[PDB]
Amino acid sequence: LNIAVLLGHSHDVTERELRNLWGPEQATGLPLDVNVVALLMNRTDPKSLITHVCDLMSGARIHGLVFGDDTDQEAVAQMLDFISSQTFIPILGIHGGASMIMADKDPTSTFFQFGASIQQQATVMLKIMQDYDWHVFSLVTTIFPGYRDFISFIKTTVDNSFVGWDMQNVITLDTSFEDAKTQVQLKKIHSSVILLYCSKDEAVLILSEARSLGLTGYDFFWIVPSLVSGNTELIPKEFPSGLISVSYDDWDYSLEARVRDGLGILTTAASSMLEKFSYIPEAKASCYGQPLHTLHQFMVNVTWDGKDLSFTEEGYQVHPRLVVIVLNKDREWEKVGKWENQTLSLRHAVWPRYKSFSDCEPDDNHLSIVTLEEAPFVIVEDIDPLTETCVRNTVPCRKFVKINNSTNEGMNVKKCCKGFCIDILKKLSRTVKFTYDLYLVTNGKHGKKVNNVWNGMIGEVVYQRAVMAVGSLTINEERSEVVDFSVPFVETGISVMVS
């Protein structure tokens, strides 16, 4: 039907590509009169919002409003939610402040957002923590609002997960910190992974206190949400290089594809509601002056061109597109990973160190360890599909399995390991109390020199791509020439098997 798409942008996004968004789109047109009104607004005040709503609602009874924002104002989405409550018109928020996450909607309002809420983002972040076995962690909550729901969601998620999370007690705040009573709660922290829920101007002081108290070590982790991480240009120098963030800001999908998907959802809802009831277009005539069949609880079942764009009970997407980013050494928000329907994808399955967060951090405690698949020593099995977690005695590792012989591209499949040398390495980690980097070799067997070129674990250790070989390895003359073996611990010779 009549749908108006108004866009408030600062970047030069023209209007004629929205005029071309009507022709080939909706080839199977079930409404007999589908019309679009493309408009561009330069100002971002709510007076213009009220003015354009009174213009377009009286403009031949437009039943669809689509808005995107370029600024950093979350109150514009609340104003559009109030407009959708008053005018009873389904309004969609696309980008920026029109897509910023709000807490609770109303049954009188039919406003919807194309975004990712903080609850699903916390689910994704705890999925990241489950996939890394980072079970000993903490939680610091400030006086930034929407925080008790976050604590309660963490409590219910820990109570409904197979991990059994070792969670340190919640460090709470009251005001801006005096560094007298909050100092005691920050000095209780001895765990690695630190979670935080605050604003950016609070996070500057939090990271300044954490650097002042030395909480930015190589062991210590920092995972922040998307609401504290604001503009991609405005990055202060107090951020640790390696800051984990999760935001749905995908640069691969532009605003035009998102509003095309929104128009597809609107036409899908209109065509599916027209098949049930006849008198579907019902709007308000004009603003000046003193509903039963609605699309508020109808388009939960929606799928546009195979894309799972279904809607939740709260009004958000069922399966959005989350993007896991970090902060590199070049002070840029580096795009790392994308998210699937329910499961999580990882382009960089190898977790990077970023061990030098600042300039003066002399740290050399990690150890690169590789082994080889042998049955009585390193039992290499799949991950448990019921838990998606290696059991207590098994440890995770990676294996670079190639797809074919046509390309050299492969995937680092993560698997579980147990056995003899796994127990030896775990007891070495108990005694020495170091940090290890366990993975598998994909070159082949133990070692063989082919024209001054070694292979396997010898090629990994001699060419210094690892540190030491904990797994099983025979000892002869040239291997003792190229590296330095330790003392022997097990008496393993050779034998001949007969009947």
Add this chain to the structure above:
Amino acid sequence: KIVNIGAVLSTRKHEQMFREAVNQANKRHGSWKIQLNATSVTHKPNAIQMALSVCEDLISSQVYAILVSHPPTPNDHFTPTPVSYTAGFYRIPVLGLTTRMSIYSDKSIHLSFLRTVPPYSHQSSVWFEMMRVYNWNHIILLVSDDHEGRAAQKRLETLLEERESKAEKVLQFDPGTKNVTALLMEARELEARVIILSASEDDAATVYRAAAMLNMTGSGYVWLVGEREISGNALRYAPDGIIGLQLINGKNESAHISDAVGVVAQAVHELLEKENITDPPRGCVGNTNIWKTGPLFKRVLMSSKYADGVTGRVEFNEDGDRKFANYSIMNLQNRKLVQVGIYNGTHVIPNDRKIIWPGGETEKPRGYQMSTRLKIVTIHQEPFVYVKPTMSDGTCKEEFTVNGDPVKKVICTGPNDTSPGSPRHTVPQCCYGFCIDLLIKLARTMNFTYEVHLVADGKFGTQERVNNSNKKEWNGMMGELLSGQADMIVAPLTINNERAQYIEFSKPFKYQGLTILVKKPEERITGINDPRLRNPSDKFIYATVKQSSVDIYFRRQVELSTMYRHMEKHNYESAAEAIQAVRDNKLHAFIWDSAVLEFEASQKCDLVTTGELFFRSGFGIGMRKDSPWKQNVSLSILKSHENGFMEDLDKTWVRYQE
């Protein structure tokens, strides 16, 4: 050198009082050159063009404080939201004065909203003061308004964090329906009588009529409501003797306006003493730049401490609420509002008037009556729970044993078969045996009736992912107990560390270990230390009951994952299925408790147990949390331990051989 104050006020007398308070605000503040102007607007019956007129008039006026002071509005929406949102676009504090909705408490939504009235959830803290006075622990929550229901649950958990108790029943549903009396009867069957209600007038009158028709307003029924529930037809439908709350000067607008003028005036004179002064621009035309001292002026309003006013010590918390609020506690004595208490910010004092209750005496009714009919659920244990079909119609054939002991059966209710086998066939049959005689001994010791029914499946209950939202749930006897449908599990409960974290345990009545059922070259296995069972094959077929606690005990064992992967392909529904399968020589081993297989070896000589005795544990009675049915019942169990009644139960089934 001017400060503008915007207001949405109707009556001309209160506009004159507001202008008089603005004029008197500059009296004691010296001859300083600051000026105060006030701009008040009326109200058009609509809400969009009202928001338009007010927002552009306050942009053209460049005000600092925005006030809405309209209680008696005919629209029940009570929404000053759009003007507050427009001021939050430039982070300008709007001081709401009338409504008490919890949607305004969210500062993430309402970025620049302040108020001098608390929400109703703080009244629950006053009701927690009732818990500080009347010493009542178990409550029954009923909230219809789901916009404030999550905040009420949050405040209730915050209050219960101190005592570390739990609410017995919580309810959230859609306002507008009428058939909520089923959950009212389910709350009536509970031990507590404390009724906490949080809804509008219509749902309050509906549940008053529902309690009046079903007579839930008799003796001991605790009723405790607020100001919204004692107005309109809910006041007409209210029973006599109900206890409610009253906001002192909650609707008295004239002193409230002067208090707001004093608060805003001292906030402005505090802000004038500091630097970085910014002004709101002409945001209607060509100005989207935000007012930079928004959170700065908010921080000025955070530490605002006052000492003037008829109400008293007005003070803001971290949520910007009202501290130290005088409340009144009213009683409805024969359709007349009678004051029975006063409340300062921390303490309740009843007045000289008496507290007349809807039940009996004027003292507090202890509405914690324990269940005299304990709902008993059990599983069909083969030597312990004998279930026999009825002879003609719901009867039990009173047969006699060989030792002159008449079998005292009971009419239990149980399903017929499994759910793919039997869709719906639940009949009353005759239950007797070991734990039935234990319950007879318990009913002989302590006078209490009971209700023996059966669990719907043949499983103990395991901790399994439900198929949505990644949530842990229980099932079986634990799933029927934690849902409130059961009261006491009388069954040989396998005591472990996981279930001890969730419920409380009693003393074990049975003490035994584990063993292997075989049929009679090494015909024996001698326990878990057989190396062929460490690395099994398709020959040695060994398994256990599906979803049993033995599987959980092996799941804790992190060195026997091979048996956990092997036995999952052959888990049966019941142990009698395993007995029938090894009777046909299809099984080879079965981990099970000791004395059950000893009794079955006494019944059938081909059934052979193993020699070792590992996991020497005890079986007791499945129980609830902290409850008065724990100590006396445990003393009765120990009284059964000390005498020869355990030997009598041995003479019934254990010592008796063939």
